[PDB]
Structure formats: C-alpha cells, structure tokens
Amino acid sequence: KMCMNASCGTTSTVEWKKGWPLRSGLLADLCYRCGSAYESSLFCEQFHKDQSGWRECYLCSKRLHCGCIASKVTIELMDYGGVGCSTCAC
Amino acid sequence: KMCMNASCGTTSTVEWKKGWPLRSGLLADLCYRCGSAYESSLFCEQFHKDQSGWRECYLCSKRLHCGCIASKVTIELMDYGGVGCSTCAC
Ligand SMILES: [Zn+2]
Ligand SMILES: [Zn+2]
Ligand SMILES: [Zn+2]
Ligand SMILES: [Zn+2]
Ligand SMILES: [Zn+2]
Ligand SMILES: [Zn+2]
C-alpha cells in the first residue's frame, strides 16, 4: 500500500484508511493522516488549497474543489451552470 | 422553450437545439447560437471564460471548465487528483 494523496505517498503509517472511489470503482488507500482528513470531509481544504478548480456553492458560497475526485461525491453540478453543496442543491 | 444558457435565455430563435444532459437525465434546450457553440464543443470557451472552475488537463494542458454541467462529458477526474481530456485520460 501507498497513500494515494500525491503530496504524501507514504508507505508507512500507523493505520491504513480508505478514501474516494477510484475510476476503477474501487476505493483509494490513504494513510492515517490523509485518511482522517478525508473522513472529516476536509481533505480538499487541507491539501488542495493552492490548486485550480475551486468554485463557490451557488447558495451558501462554501468553497468546493471542482475537477477533483476527492470532492466529487460532495459537489452537485447544477442544471444551468455552477455548483452546489449536496445540501444546497438537493 | 427558453435557452438554458443563463447569459442568453432567449425565447425566440431561428432554430432550437439540444445541449447537455440535465440532472433530470433529460437534455437541455439551447437557441441556435448557444446550441451551435455546444455542438462545436466550445460552449465553455465561448461563454464561461470569466467563471471559476477552470483547470488544465494533466497531459496536454488544455483548459477544462470544471464544476460545469456543460463540459461534464468531456472531462475525466483522475484517480490521484486533477483532470484530463477524454483523449488524454483514456
Ligand atoms: Zn498520506
Ligand atoms: Zn481536491
Ligand atoms: Zn452550499
Ligand atoms: Zn441562447
Ligand atoms: Zn462551463
Ligand atoms: Zn488533454
């Protein structure tokens, strides 16, 4: 196992964890630190701050990391453009 | 019918066209101008230049409008972050 957080990529951790669904449909491997962040639903806030792709929810203005598999399940693409939190879209 | 391009929204056009799949699974209505842009695969280049969400393909650096239903079918979310054109990912 290797942690699938590119900025991390450790092979040693006190405990392995699971992350997002891969394009294979299988579930990514994360180290204890990165996996804890993912479970907290703050993976992209913690690791992808500098990256391109951030938009704002159309209703609450929460920052949403688009074009990113790690946040895919929490972002709704809206019918006429833009994105919403799963809360605010549904 | 009303063109589902928010910057447009006309109700009069010489010819109606179809756009992206809606979250209902049905297919959006676009006027002749916006629909032509969509068929050309340059809708987001033509209308969403100023918007947030643009990333670069991990391999060819093409600009890809993420968090956007109009480009959803042309963008692959990669297993470890970032995006690729359908060409470069597959
Ligand atoms: Zn890690
Ligand atoms: Zn992210
Ligand atoms: Zn929201
Ligand atoms: Zn139009
Ligand atoms: Zn777009
Ligand atoms: Zn590409």
Curated annotation (Swiss-Prot), chains A, B:
What does the tissue specificity note say?
Expressed in flowers and at lower levels in roots, stems and leaves.
Q: Which domain of life is it from?
A: Eukaryota
Subcellular location field: Nucleus
Per UniProt, subunit arrangement is:
Interacts with SNL1.
- What does this protein do, in the record's words? Transcriptional repressor of gene expression involved in embryonic pathways, such as LEC1, ABI3, and FUS3. Repressor of the sugar-inducible genes involved in the seed maturation program in seedlings. Plays an essential role in regulating the transition from seed maturation to seedling growth. Functionally redundant with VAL2/HSL1.
Descriptive protein name: B3 domain-containing transcription repressor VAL1
Q: Which organism is it from?
A: Arabidopsis thaliana (Mouse-ear cress)
- Gene from which the chain derives: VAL1
